[PDB]
Design a protein around this motif. Structure first.
Motif, PDB file in Angstrom:
ATOM      1  N   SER A 111       0.830  -1.192   0.000  1.00  0.00           N
ATOM      2  CA  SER A 111       0.000   0.000   0.000  1.00  0.00           C
ATOM      3  C   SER A 111       0.872   1.252   0.000  1.00  0.00           C
ATOM      4  O   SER A 111       2.076   1.212   0.270  1.00  0.00           O
ATOM      5  CB  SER A 111      -0.935   0.015   1.209  1.00  0.00           C
ATOM      6  OG  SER A 111      -0.202  -0.025   2.422  1.00  0.00           O
ATOM      7  N   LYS A 112       0.249   2.373  -0.326  1.00  0.00           N
ATOM      8  CA  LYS A 112       0.834   3.692  -0.142  1.00  0.00           C
ATOM      9  C   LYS A 112       0.079   4.386   0.988  1.00  0.00           C
ATOM     10  O   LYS A 112      -0.853   3.826   1.570  1.00  0.00           O
ATOM     11  CB  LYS A 112       0.793   4.475  -1.455  1.00  0.00           C
ATOM     12  CG  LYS A 112       1.654   3.831  -2.549  1.00  0.00           C
ATOM     13  CD  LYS A 112       2.159   4.837  -3.572  1.00  0.00           C
ATOM     14  CE  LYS A 112       2.988   4.150  -4.652  1.00  0.00           C
ATOM     15  NZ  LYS A 112       2.457   4.397  -6.023  1.00  0.00           N
ATOM     16  N   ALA A 113       0.485   5.609   1.326  1.00  0.00           N
ATOM     17  CA  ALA A 113      -0.142   6.275   2.457  1.00  0.00           C
ATOM     18  C   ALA A 113      -0.273   7.767   2.199  1.00  0.00           C
ATOM     19  O   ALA A 113       0.505   8.357   1.445  1.00  0.00           O
ATOM     20  CB  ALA A 113       0.639   6.044   3.758  1.00  0.00           C
ATOM     21  N   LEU A 160      -3.883   4.466   4.897  1.00  0.00           N
ATOM     22  CA  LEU A 160      -3.339   3.570   3.885  1.00  0.00           C
ATOM     23  C   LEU A 160      -4.271   3.474   2.684  1.00  0.00           C
ATOM     24  O   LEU A 160      -5.496   3.482   2.830  1.00  0.00           O
ATOM     25  CB  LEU A 160      -3.107   2.176   4.470  1.00  0.00           C
ATOM     26  CG  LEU A 160      -2.249   2.089   5.737  1.00  0.00           C
ATOM     27  CD1 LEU A 160      -2.125   0.643   6.233  1.00  0.00           C
ATOM     28  CD2 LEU A 160      -0.862   2.700   5.527  1.00  0.00           C
ATOM     29  N   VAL A 161      -3.683   3.388   1.493  1.00  0.00           N
ATOM     30  CA  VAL A 161      -4.439   3.224   0.254  1.00  0.00           C
ATOM     31  C   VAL A 161      -3.776   2.165  -0.605  1.00  0.00           C
ATOM     32  O   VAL A 161      -2.546   2.127  -0.729  1.00  0.00           O
ATOM     33  CB  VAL A 161      -4.578   4.537  -0.542  1.00  0.00           C
ATOM     34  CG1 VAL A 161      -5.329   5.541   0.248  1.00  0.00           C
ATOM     35  CG2 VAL A 161      -3.196   5.095  -0.901  1.00  0.00           C
ATOM     36  N   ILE A 169     -12.195   7.034  12.290  1.00  0.00           N
ATOM     37  CA  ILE A 169     -11.394   5.946  11.734  1.00  0.00           C
ATOM     38  C   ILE A 169     -12.046   4.602  12.044  1.00  0.00           C
ATOM     39  O   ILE A 169     -12.188   3.750  11.160  1.00  0.00           O
ATOM     40  CB  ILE A 169      -9.953   5.996  12.269  1.00  0.00           C
ATOM     41  CG1 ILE A 169      -9.209   7.202  11.718  1.00  0.00           C
ATOM     42  CG2 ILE A 169      -9.195   4.736  11.873  1.00  0.00           C
ATOM     43  CD1 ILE A 169      -7.966   7.504  12.512  1.00  0.00           C
ATOM     44  N   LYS A 170     -12.442   4.392  13.308  1.00  0.00           N
ATOM     45  CA  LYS A 170     -13.132   3.159  13.688  1.00  0.00           C
ATOM     46  C   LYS A 170     -14.365   2.929  12.826  1.00  0.00           C
ATOM     47  O   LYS A 170     -14.584   1.828  12.309  1.00  0.00           O
ATOM     48  CB  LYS A 170     -13.540   3.190  15.168  1.00  0.00           C
ATOM     49  CG  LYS A 170     -12.628   2.415  16.117  1.00  0.00           C
ATOM     50  CD  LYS A 170     -12.923   2.738  17.584  1.00  0.00           C
ATOM     51  CE  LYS A 170     -14.113   1.915  18.094  1.00  0.00           C
ATOM     52  NZ  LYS A 170     -14.088   1.653  19.578  1.00  0.00           N
ATOM     53  N   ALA A 171     -15.184   3.966  12.657  1.00  0.00           N
ATOM     54  CA  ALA A 171     -16.447   3.834  11.944  1.00  0.00           C
ATOM     55  C   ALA A 171     -16.287   3.674  10.434  1.00  0.00           C
ATOM     56  O   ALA A 171     -17.271   3.347   9.764  1.00  0.00           O
ATOM     57  CB  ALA A 171     -17.334   5.044  12.251  1.00  0.00           C
ATOM     58  N   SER A 172     -15.097   3.898   9.886  1.00  0.00           N
ATOM     59  CA  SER A 172     -14.836   3.799   8.459  1.00  0.00           C
ATOM     60  C   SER A 172     -14.153   2.467   8.181  1.00  0.00           C
ATOM     61  O   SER A 172     -13.672   1.794   9.093  1.00  0.00           O
ATOM     62  CB  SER A 172     -13.975   4.982   7.999  1.00  0.00           C
ATOM     63  OG  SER A 172     -12.614   4.747   8.305  1.00  0.00           O
ATOM     64  N   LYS A 173     -14.118   2.075   6.911  1.00  0.00           N
ATOM     65  CA  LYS A 173     -13.390   0.868   6.532  1.00  0.00           C
ATOM     66  C   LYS A 173     -11.891   1.107   6.322  1.00  0.00           C
ATOM     67  O   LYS A 173     -11.149   0.167   5.992  1.00  0.00           O
ATOM     68  CB  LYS A 173     -13.967   0.277   5.256  1.00  0.00           C
ATOM     69  CG  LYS A 173     -15.345  -0.234   5.302  1.00  0.00           C
ATOM     70  CD  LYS A 173     -15.604  -0.793   3.920  1.00  0.00           C
ATOM     71  CE  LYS A 173     -16.956  -1.382   3.968  1.00  0.00           C
ATOM     72  NZ  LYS A 173     -17.814  -0.209   4.170  1.00  0.00           N
ATOM     73  N   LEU A 174     -11.431   2.342   6.479  1.00  0.00           N
ATOM     74  CA  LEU A 174     -10.041   2.651   6.199  1.00  0.00           C
ATOM     75  C   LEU A 174      -9.172   2.170   7.344  1.00  0.00           C
ATOM     76  O   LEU A 174      -9.619   2.066   8.490  1.00  0.00           O
ATOM     77  CB  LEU A 174      -9.852   4.154   5.993  1.00  0.00           C
ATOM     78  CG  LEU A 174     -10.677   4.798   4.876  1.00  0.00           C
ATOM     79  CD1 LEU A 174     -10.651   6.323   4.984  1.00  0.00           C
ATOM     80  CD2 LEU A 174     -10.197   4.327   3.507  1.00  0.00           C
ATOM     81  N   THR A 175      -7.931   1.842   7.014  1.00  0.00           N
ATOM     82  CA  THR A 175      -6.901   1.618   8.012  1.00  0.00           C
ATOM     83  C   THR A 175      -6.169   2.931   8.249  1.00  0.00           C
ATOM     84  O   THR A 175      -5.571   3.489   7.321  1.00  0.00           O
ATOM     85  CB  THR A 175      -5.922   0.537   7.565  1.00  0.00           C
ATOM     86  OG1 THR A 175      -6.638  -0.680   7.311  1.00  0.00           O
ATOM     87  CG2 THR A 175      -4.873   0.304   8.641  1.00  0.00           C
ATOM     88  N   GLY A 176      -6.233   3.420   9.473  1.00  0.00           N
ATOM     89  CA  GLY A 176      -5.519   4.628   9.849  1.00  0.00           C
ATOM     90  C   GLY A 176      -4.804   4.434  11.166  1.00  0.00           C
ATOM     91  O   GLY A 176      -5.323   3.793  12.081  1.00  0.00           O
ATOM     92  N   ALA A 177      -3.589   4.962  11.238  1.00  0.00           N
ATOM     93  CA  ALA A 177      -2.853   5.073  12.484  1.00  0.00           C
ATOM     94  C   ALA A 177      -2.699   6.551  12.815  1.00  0.00           C
ATOM     95  O   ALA A 177      -2.595   7.390  11.916  1.00  0.00           O
ATOM     96  CB  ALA A 177      -1.481   4.399  12.387  1.00  0.00           C
ATOM     97  N   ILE A 178      -2.716   6.868  14.105  1.00  0.00           N
ATOM     98  CA  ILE A 178      -2.638   8.247  14.579  1.00  0.00           C
ATOM     99  C   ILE A 178      -1.342   8.435  15.355  1.00  0.00           C
ATOM    100  O   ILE A 178      -1.007   7.625  16.229  1.00  0.00           O
ATOM    101  CB  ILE A 178      -3.852   8.616  15.446  1.00  0.00           C
ATOM    102  CG1 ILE A 178      -5.141   8.483  14.638  1.00  0.00           C
ATOM    103  CG2 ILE A 178      -3.699  10.029  15.982  1.00  0.00           C
ATOM    104  CD1 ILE A 178      -6.389   8.595  15.489  1.00  0.00           C
ATOM    105  N   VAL A 179      -0.627   9.519  15.054  1.00  0.00           N
ATOM    106  CA  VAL A 179       0.650   9.804  15.695  1.00  0.00           C
ATOM    107  C   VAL A 179       0.902  11.299  15.562  1.00  0.00           C
ATOM    108  O   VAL A 179       0.430  11.933  14.616  1.00  0.00           O
ATOM    109  CB  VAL A 179       1.784   8.965  15.045  1.00  0.00           C
ATOM    110  CG1 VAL A 179       2.017   9.411  13.591  1.00  0.00           C
ATOM    111  CG2 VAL A 179       3.080   9.054  15.846  1.00  0.00           C
ATOM    112  N   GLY A 180       1.641  11.867  16.504  1.00  0.00           N
ATOM    113  CA  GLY A 180       2.274  13.131  16.172  1.00  0.00           C
ATOM    114  C   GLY A 180       2.433  14.076  17.347  1.00  0.00           C
ATOM    115  O   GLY A 180       2.356  13.696  18.515  1.00  0.00           O
TER     116      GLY A 180
END
Ligand SMILES: Cc1cc2nc3c(=O)[nH]c(=O)nc-3n(C[C@H](O)[C@H](O)[C@H](O)COP(=O)(O)OP(=O)(O)OC[C@H]3O[C@@H](n4cnc5c(N)ncnc54)[C@H](O)[C@@H]3O)c2cc1C
Ligand SMILES: CC(C)C(=O)C(=O)O
Ligand SMILES: [Mn+2]
Length: 455
Positions: free
Chosen positions: A332-334, A380-381, A357-368
């Motif tokens: 994947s890309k991001a 991720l895509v 993010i939870k409610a969507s089908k996407l994979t997301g990580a949170i940081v910063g």
């Protein structure tokens, strides 16, 4: 590009430093973002500033777009050659000069990375603090307005860039604060240095940066603190800032990010986590630690898991969070978001982002960099799933707009590139846009300085 023009480029920089080969152009047509590779028509490596000036003048007067290229670690497609043209790879100019330890200053050429500079400064008692996760060109960092984990205490590139050497689009050489100058403050004329920080190669080519250096901390302590919820971690962050604890680093990772980093590097509890670092004397550290532990405990934080050997692997894992996230779905890309809001609104928007993010089908990580009111959602895509990339676009834009509704900005450090041009128009409005465009037009009348970016 015509053969006469290519031979003219070769006359300036030398035959080995001009390439029209498809593979070389393709490697310079993208950065680390998901933006589609758009190869320049040629890649050129100037060997000194005179050559940069003469390459710029050649391109500009022939109507050929110019794309400055540092280390290619950007995440908004800044180097994508959307209108073709000449990619100027600046990294063969790689010297550190004018090291002034007594003044806390140094001058670096575009090939110098942060790691190279700090290696050069070992045993000086000085260091350069602004720390993107990538091994990036320091002049590229000036061009994007970068920050990093250390910015909450030591400032961004905007805080630490004292002077810039800029080749303007038609080849003229500008030293934004004056040739050779370095000082703590000035009211002399209009501040040109700040205009070129965060200009992303659309106003000129940065061929050197004068940087503020900082003293190495007397002592350092790093730690991690696990929380029951995103809410608890971000409330702790806001309360640490409002209590004015001068934390050196305060980095947020949600449970998804923590798990990704564990698998890619660490064995921290899989939970929303703060990575913390404190600088000072022992007494000063003990005072900061007591006040920070009191606040984190109030919000259900664990006892601090303490961490040079451990400390370096902690922050190496953090700096590689982008690649840890990508490794969750190989191939994947991001896309990274990068909103920054007033700190009191940070709990609402992170918790809301986590729920979305939870409610969507996407994979997301949170940081910063939550000490700045700033954070990244790494989405991720699949490069071949056009529907997923539409949903990642829609998600990124909706988050950007929520940040603007809270009085914040659509990007705290990464910049606009190709990805946030519509959000910027919403952020600053018609008079802000026209003013920005008038500044672009005076420095780049023909519109050949990295076209299609920012505006
Ligand atoms: C794993 C990872 C972690 C990252 N972490 C951070 C982070 O914490 N903070 C952060 O702010 N960014 C971060 N980034 C993004 C990136 O590292 C920064 O934006 C960095 O400043 C880009 O520098 P570069 O030379 O690699 O840029 P490039 O991709 O080469 O170029 C970026 C843009 O600036 C222009 N440009 C580059 N060099 C010059 C120059 N000398 N003169 C004029 N214009 C120029 C280009 O034309 C382009 O528009 C991260 C990236 C990765 C892959
Ligand atoms: C997510 C990447 C792009 C970043 O900016 C960081 O590591 O903070
Ligand atoms: Mn970052």
């Amino acid at each position: 590009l015509s053969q006469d023009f290519v031979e003219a480029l070769k006359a300036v920089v030398g035959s080995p430093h001009v390439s029209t080969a498809s593979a070389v152009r393709e490697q310079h047509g993208h950065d680390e973002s998901m933006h589609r590779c758009q190869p320049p028509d040629a890649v050129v490596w100037p060997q000194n500033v005179d050559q940069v000036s003469r390459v710029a003048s050649l391109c500009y007067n022939q109507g050929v777009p110019i794309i400055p290229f540092g280390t290619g670690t950007g995440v908004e497609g800044g180097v994508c050659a959307v209108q073709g043209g000449v990619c100027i790879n600046l990294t063969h100019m790689d010297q550190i000069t004018e090291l002034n330890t007594e003044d806390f200053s140094v001058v670096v050429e575009p090939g110098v990375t942060r790691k190279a500079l700090n290696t050069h400064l070992r045993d000086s008692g000085l260091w350069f603090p602004v720390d993107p996760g990538a091994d990036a060109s320091l002049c590229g960092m000036a061009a994007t307005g970068a920050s990093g984990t250390n910015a909450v205490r030591y400032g961004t590139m905007r805080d630490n860039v004292i002077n810039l050497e800029v080749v303007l689009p038609d080849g003229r050489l500008l030293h934004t604060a004056g040739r050779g100058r370095h000082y703590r403050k000035s009211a002399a004329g209009y501040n040109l240095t700040g205009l070129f920080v965060g200009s992303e190669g659309t106003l000129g080519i940065i061929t050197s940066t004068t940087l503020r250096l900082h003293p190495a901390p007397e002592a350092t302590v790093a730690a991690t603190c696990a929380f029951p919820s995103v809410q608890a971690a971000v409330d702790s962050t806001v309360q640490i800032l409002q209590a004015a604890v001068p934390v050196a680093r305060i980095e947020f990772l949600d449970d998804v990010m923590m798990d990704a980093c564990n698998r890619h590097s660490l064995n921290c509890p899989v939970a929303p986590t703060l990575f913390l670092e404190f600088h000072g004397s022992q007494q000063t550290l003990a005072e900061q630690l007591q006040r920070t532990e009191a606040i984190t405990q109030d919000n259900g934080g664990s006892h601090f898991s303490w961490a040079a050997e451990k400390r370096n692997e902690l922050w190496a894992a953090r700096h590689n969070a982008w690649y840890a996230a990508l490794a969750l779905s190989p191939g994947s890309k991001a896309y990274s978001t990068d909103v920054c809001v007033p700190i009191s609104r940070l709990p609402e928007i992170l918790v809301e982002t986590k729920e979305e993010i939870k409610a969507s089908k996407l994979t997301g990580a949170i940081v910063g960099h939550v000490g700045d009111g700033n954070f990244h959602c790494i989405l991720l895509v699949d490069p071949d799933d056009a529907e997923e990339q539409r949903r990642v676009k829609a998600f990124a834009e909706n988050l950007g707009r929520r940040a603007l509704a809270l009085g914040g900005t659509c990007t705290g450090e990464h910049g606009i590139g190709l990805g946030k041009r519509q959000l910027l128009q919403e952020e600053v409005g018609p008079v802000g846009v026209e003013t920005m465009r008038q500044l672009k037009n005076t420095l780049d009348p023909r519109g050949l300085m990295n076209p299609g970016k920012v505006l």
